[PDB]
Every structure is written in C-alpha cells, then in structure tokens.
User: Fold ADP-ribosylation factor 1 from Arabidopsis thaliana.
Amino acid sequence: SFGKLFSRLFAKKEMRILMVGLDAAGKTTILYKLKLGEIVTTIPTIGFNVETVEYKNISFTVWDVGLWRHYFQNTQGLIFVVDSNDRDRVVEARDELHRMLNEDELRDAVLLVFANKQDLPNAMNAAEITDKLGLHSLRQRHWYIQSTCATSGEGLYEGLDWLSNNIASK
Ligand SMILES: Nc1nc2c(ncn2[C@@H]2O[C@H](COP(=O)(O)OP(=O)(O)O)[C@@H](O)[C@H]2O)c(=O)[nH]1
Ligand SMILES: [Mg+2]
Assistant:
C-alpha cells in the first residue's frame, strides 16, 4: 500500500515529512494507519513530545500545534491535519497552518492538508475547509487538500500519492 508510494523517494538524501495539527485532529491515528514502522515517542525538550516513524530514508515526524526550527532543514513535505467536524477550532487551525507556512526554512516544502473525520455526519466538506483555511490565497506553494477518514484509512492513499509524486518530481 503506502510503502510503494514512498519508495519513489529512494534517491533523496535523508528527509523529513512533518505532520502537524491541533490536538485531536487525528495525527497519531494516521501515523498508525500508514503501517510503515513503529511509532516512537521522544521528548527532546521538556514538555515537547514528538512521535516519529522511520521508513527507509524518510522520517515522519509528528507533533501537536496550538525550537521546532532544527527539524525544518530537511523537511520536504508538510502535512496539516484538521478535524473537519470541529467548527469551533478551525480558526485556530488556520492560524497554526499559516504560522508554519511563515517559516523561511519551510519555503520549498510541499503542503498536503488532510480534512479528516469526513465520516462524521456534520463534518465540513473539503471545499468549506479550503475556504476556511485560506488555501485559495496561497500563490507560490504547491498544496493539495484531501478528505479523509483516518480510522478507516479512506483518502490517505490518494493524498499521499499526490504528496510523494510532488516531492519525487523535484
Ligand atoms: N470519527 C472519526 N474519528 C477519528 C478520525 N481520525 C481520528 N479519530 C479519532 O479522534 C481522536 C483523536 O485521534 P488522535 O490520532 O489521537 O489525534 P491527535 O491528537 O491529532 O494525535 C481519537 O478518538 C480517534 O479515534 C476520523 O477520521 N473519524
Ligand atoms: Mg497524537
């Protein structure tokens, strides 16, 4: 499944794909669903828990948003996970997304937004999320938004296919 997607990137030097988002967005769930290796938790500085899956030359690195700079230098992809059902935190998610995009060291990173929890009845759809995250206003960035249900895995392949293809082409 996902392994073949990411083995496209074999030619690259050691790289990072950062996946961030507010607490409860579904990040840990997605990491587990990838099935690309054990999720290992480290605490590099007091109060800062990082989860990492190392698959071949790729480190999937996950923390909650809402001294990160040393991680950015080899980050090729940025995945931003939003709870599509959490209307009351979408403004906060927009702010955290754009602060991340304001980091000079992430200028060239490819952006994948997972609009997660699409299984939920009252979830905002991907178009609403796009509007509310100000994605249409980005002009230099390569970005894509993908509707997902992390607990079933639905949508993960499609979004990761896009992400890996976009990094690979560089
Ligand atoms: N309904 C629904 N629940 C989800 C989905 N993805 C994750 N969750 C749930 O949301 C909660 C938070 O997930 P978690 O992976 O720990 O979020 P994290 O804080 O971003 O690491 C858990 O109860 C998950 O089962 C989804 O697509 N749909
Ligand atoms: Mg988590």
Remarks:
- Helices lie at 2-6, 27-34, 90-101, 126-133, 156-168.
- The two ends are 23 Å apart (CA to CA).
- Strands lie at 15-22, 40-45, 48-55, 58-65, 75-83, 110-116, 143-147.
